[PDB]
Design an enzyme around this catalytic site. Sequence first.
Site, short mmCIF file in Angstrom:
data_model
loop_
_atom_site.label_atom_id
_atom_site.label_comp_id
_atom_site.label_asym_id
_atom_site.label_seq_id
_atom_site.Cartn_x
_atom_site.Cartn_y
_atom_site.Cartn_z
N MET A 41 32.73 32.36 -26.73
CA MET A 41 31.78 33.35 -27.26
C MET A 41 30.48 33.38 -26.46
O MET A 41 29.43 33.81 -26.96
CB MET A 41 31.50 33.10 -28.74
CG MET A 41 32.72 33.15 -29.52
SD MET A 41 32.44 33.25 -31.31
CE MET A 41 31.64 31.70 -31.65
N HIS A 65 27.62 26.05 -22.65
CA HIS A 65 27.07 24.70 -22.54
C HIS A 65 28.12 23.76 -21.98
O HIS A 65 29.24 24.19 -21.66
CB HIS A 65 26.55 24.18 -23.87
CG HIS A 65 27.55 24.21 -24.95
ND1 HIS A 65 28.62 23.34 -24.99
CD2 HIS A 65 27.68 25.02 -26.02
CE1 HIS A 65 29.38 23.64 -26.04
NE2 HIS A 65 28.81 24.64 -26.69
N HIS A 86 31.80 23.86 -23.13
CA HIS A 86 32.59 24.92 -22.52
C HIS A 86 32.93 24.55 -21.08
O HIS A 86 34.06 24.81 -20.61
CB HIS A 86 31.80 26.22 -22.43
CG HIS A 86 31.34 26.75 -23.73
ND1 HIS A 86 30.02 26.81 -24.10
CD2 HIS A 86 32.04 27.27 -24.77
CE1 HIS A 86 29.92 27.35 -25.31
NE2 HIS A 86 31.13 27.63 -25.74
N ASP A 104 22.20 33.11 -18.94
CA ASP A 104 22.72 32.67 -17.64
C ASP A 104 24.19 32.29 -17.71
O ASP A 104 24.64 31.51 -16.90
CB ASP A 104 21.93 31.48 -17.09
CG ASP A 104 21.90 30.31 -18.01
OD1 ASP A 104 22.51 30.37 -19.09
OD2 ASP A 104 21.25 29.28 -17.72
N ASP A 105 24.91 32.86 -18.68
CA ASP A 105 26.33 32.56 -18.81
C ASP A 105 27.08 32.84 -17.52
O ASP A 105 27.86 32.02 -17.04
CB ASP A 105 26.99 33.36 -19.93
CG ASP A 105 26.63 32.89 -21.32
OD1 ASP A 105 25.99 31.78 -21.49
OD2 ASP A 105 26.99 33.60 -22.31
N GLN A 156 26.27 30.43 -14.75
CA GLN A 156 26.90 29.13 -14.93
C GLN A 156 28.36 29.19 -14.47
O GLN A 156 28.83 28.31 -13.74
CB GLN A 156 26.84 28.65 -16.38
CG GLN A 156 25.43 28.28 -16.84
CD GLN A 156 25.46 27.51 -18.14
OE1 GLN A 156 25.92 26.36 -18.16
NE2 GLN A 156 25.01 28.13 -19.22
N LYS A 185 37.16 19.94 -30.65
CA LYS A 185 36.11 20.02 -31.66
C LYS A 185 36.50 20.94 -32.81
O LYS A 185 36.22 20.65 -33.98
CB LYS A 185 34.81 20.55 -31.06
CG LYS A 185 33.64 20.63 -32.06
CD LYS A 185 32.40 21.27 -31.45
CE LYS A 185 32.62 22.79 -31.18
NZ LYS A 185 31.39 23.44 -30.67
N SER A 210 27.62 22.02 -29.30
CA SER A 210 28.02 23.27 -29.91
C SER A 210 26.89 24.25 -29.76
O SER A 210 25.71 23.85 -29.83
CB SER A 210 28.31 23.09 -31.40
OG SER A 210 29.18 24.11 -31.94
N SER A 211 27.19 25.53 -29.57
CA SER A 211 26.10 26.52 -29.41
C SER A 211 25.15 26.49 -30.60
O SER A 211 23.94 26.72 -30.46
CB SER A 211 26.68 27.90 -29.17
OG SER A 211 27.48 27.83 -28.00
N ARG A 212 25.71 26.28 -31.78
CA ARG A 212 24.93 26.29 -33.01
C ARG A 212 23.94 25.15 -33.07
O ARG A 212 23.02 25.18 -33.89
CB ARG A 212 25.86 26.22 -34.24
CG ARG A 212 26.61 24.97 -34.35
CD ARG A 212 27.62 25.04 -35.49
NE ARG A 212 28.63 26.05 -35.17
CZ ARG A 212 29.55 26.47 -36.05
NH1 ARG A 212 29.58 25.97 -37.27
NH2 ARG A 212 30.46 27.38 -35.71
N1 LIG Z 1 31.62 20.06 -27.47
C1 LIG Z 1 32.79 20.65 -27.12
N2 LIG Z 1 33.79 20.01 -26.55
C2 LIG Z 1 34.97 20.58 -26.19
N3 LIG Z 1 35.21 21.86 -26.42
C3 LIG Z 1 34.25 22.62 -26.98
C4 LIG Z 1 32.95 22.05 -27.34
N4 LIG Z 1 32.17 23.02 -27.87
C5 LIG Z 1 32.94 24.18 -27.83
N5 LIG Z 1 34.15 23.92 -27.29
C6 LIG Z 1 35.26 24.87 -27.13
O1 LIG Z 1 34.82 25.99 -26.41
C7 LIG Z 1 35.63 27.11 -26.90
C8 LIG Z 1 34.66 28.23 -27.20
O2 LIG Z 1 33.94 27.94 -28.38
P1 LIG Z 1 32.65 28.79 -28.87
O3 LIG Z 1 32.34 29.80 -27.84
O4 LIG Z 1 32.76 29.04 -30.30
O5 LIG Z 1 31.51 27.65 -28.64
P2 LIG Z 1 30.82 26.75 -29.78
O6 LIG Z 1 30.00 25.76 -29.00
O7 LIG Z 1 31.85 26.25 -30.77
O8 LIG Z 1 29.83 27.82 -30.46
P3 LIG Z 1 29.39 27.88 -31.98
O9 LIG Z 1 28.58 26.62 -32.29
O10 LIG Z 1 28.52 29.15 -32.13
O11 LIG Z 1 30.63 27.95 -32.85
C9 LIG Z 1 36.44 26.61 -28.08
O12 LIG Z 1 37.75 26.25 -27.64
C10 LIG Z 1 35.70 25.34 -28.49
O13 LIG Z 1 36.51 24.41 -29.21
MG LIG Z 2 24.04 30.59 -20.57
MG LIG Z 3 32.57 27.60 -32.03
#
Ligand SMILES: Nc1ncnc2c1ncn2[C@@H]1O[C@H](COP(=O)(O)OP(=O)(O)OP(=O)(O)O)[C@@H](O)[C@H]1O
Ligand SMILES: [Mg+2]
Ligand SMILES: [Mg+2]
Lengths: 277, 277
Positions: B38, B42, B45, B76-77, B80, B148, B184-186
Amino acid sequence: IPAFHPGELNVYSAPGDVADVSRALRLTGRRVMLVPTMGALHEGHLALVRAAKRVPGSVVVVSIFVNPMQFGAPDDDLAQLRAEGVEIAFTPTTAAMYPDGLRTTVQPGPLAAELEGGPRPTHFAGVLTVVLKLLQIVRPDRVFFGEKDYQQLVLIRQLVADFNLDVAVVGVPTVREADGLAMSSRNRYLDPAQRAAAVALSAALTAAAHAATAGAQAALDAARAVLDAAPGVAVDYLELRDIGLGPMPLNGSGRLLVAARLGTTRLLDNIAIEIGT
Amino acid sequence: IPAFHPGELNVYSAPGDVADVSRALRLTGRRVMLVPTMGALHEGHLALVRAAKRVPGSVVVVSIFVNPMQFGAPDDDLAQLRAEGVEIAFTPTTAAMYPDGLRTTVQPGPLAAELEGGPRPTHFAGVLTVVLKLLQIVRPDRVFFGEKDYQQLVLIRQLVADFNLDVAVVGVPTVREADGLAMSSRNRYLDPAQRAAAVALSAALTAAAHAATAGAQAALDAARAVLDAAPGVAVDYLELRDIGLGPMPLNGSGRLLVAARLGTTRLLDNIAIEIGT
Ligand SMILES: Nc1ncnc2c1ncn2[C@@H]1O[C@H](COP(=O)(O)OP(=O)(O)OP(=O)(O)O)[C@@H](O)[C@H]1O
Ligand SMILES: [Mg+2]
Ligand SMILES: [Mg+2]
Ligand SMILES: Nc1ncnc2c1ncn2[C@@H]1O[C@H](COP(=O)(O)OP(=O)(O)OP(=O)(O)O)[C@@H](O)[C@H]1O
Ligand SMILES: [Mg+2]
Ligand SMILES: [Mg+2]
């Protein structure tokens, strides 16, 4: 890889075997064509096979599967396919198709609740689930469906568009008996008097198609009159729609669809209609 | 075909463009890897991207899409991704993904109503619909998901099995901050005190994983104790399950899952557990 003998009929029942063989064949440049069926083959099905075989070099895969009905809802098939030059028959068991039960499924759009979906609101979810699985197993370049099941054809186009499926959907015109009756496996349930009466569906539709120079109401009324003249025919619906099964527009192309019961057997048919010609 | 410049970032927003480019690339023997995201990228991802890039010759496709929520529910997605050697970024609009609205969809199995699906009973239908579309557009050899979101990963394996999808599903271990917090993005919504408190989720799970030599109840009680010691953490669930998210068996491998709120932000995490070791 399972053995595959080119230019002969090869029968597989495990999804993985067909998937492996299809993949290998496609890498050689042979295009793969898929014709889904429920067996009990007749000339209508053979039209789809022959359409697939027209594509040069094609490997024609014919599946034979009867999907289980959801809650609250020795033959010469293989010999016929062999004689048509079909190289793959895929004949899975229910257990092979649904090893984990009915778990993830396809939910069609609202068209599935209309027309054939009125009586059978889960029917097209089942059809689209099975077709999606067959498409993924076989990965054909083109898949062939009969216009006789026109709503099915429209819903398959929706499935392909909506899920971004990389397959061409080919609709094949309805194969009819000499009097017009649409061929269908279920016709075998008709006794001779019912088989004679059943010509009313095609007679009604063809009448309508020609009446349509005088407009949509004339077309509908002509078809209804033919059906009303056939005492042993109980009409379930008779509907004029646009070619995508939305509302018929004031001038243009449409489709007239009929479903009717003869004794315990429900028959369906449909025809192209042109208005504002 | 749309232009594709090898060894550089190429950005596409139309499904057809990516489908055309991916098809052409696969014919040359380059395997295609898909990493759905999404955006708001970070290091978590980037772990998925780097896993995809380990496959020699791979074309890594990273999609960035936020699915609309169903009823009742400058960055900057790209820079990256460019720096990671990603050759395709797929950034569709909602209209491009859903040109005919929400019509045909995927209905997950009952696991989707559990755990994360309790609060959001339509969430995984949306996830599985979008993933299925991405898989069909890109036709990757492998697709990468983070552990995760473990329930998401399990449901994607169900989608792939149930629809006979010819893709390998690769789960990538959770990337954590130095103190254990799952990236996590959140996490960007957390203030400093909440970010400090949030370490409780990983601390609880890791505690449990080591407590588990003394059995399942000891593991659960250890995790609950850690969470109960963190005042600003409101637990939504803490559940021990088998690795497929069924009932935990008496002896064997399982997964402990937690979801908790810190202020307005809901965090999730999970860990492998071994019992009867
Ligand atoms: N810390 C992490 N380690 C491994 N995989 C991750 C991690 N954070 C996200 N991902 C994976 O990246 C993919 C994209 O997830 P997404 O774009 O929802 O990011 P997110 O960090 O989970 O964002 P949000 O916190 O808004 O839910 C998913 O397969 C997710 O499981
Ligand atoms: Mg970015
Ligand atoms: Mg997520
Ligand atoms: N008369 C026909 N003309 C063209 N296509 C047909 C004809 N009859 C069946 N088909 C097509 O063959 C495919 C397989 O259909 P199916 O196996 O259900 O046969 P059927 O004759 O419709 O059987 P049933 O009467 O039990 O429904 C479908 O795409 C269907 O539209
Ligand atoms: Mg036969
Ligand atoms: Mg039929």
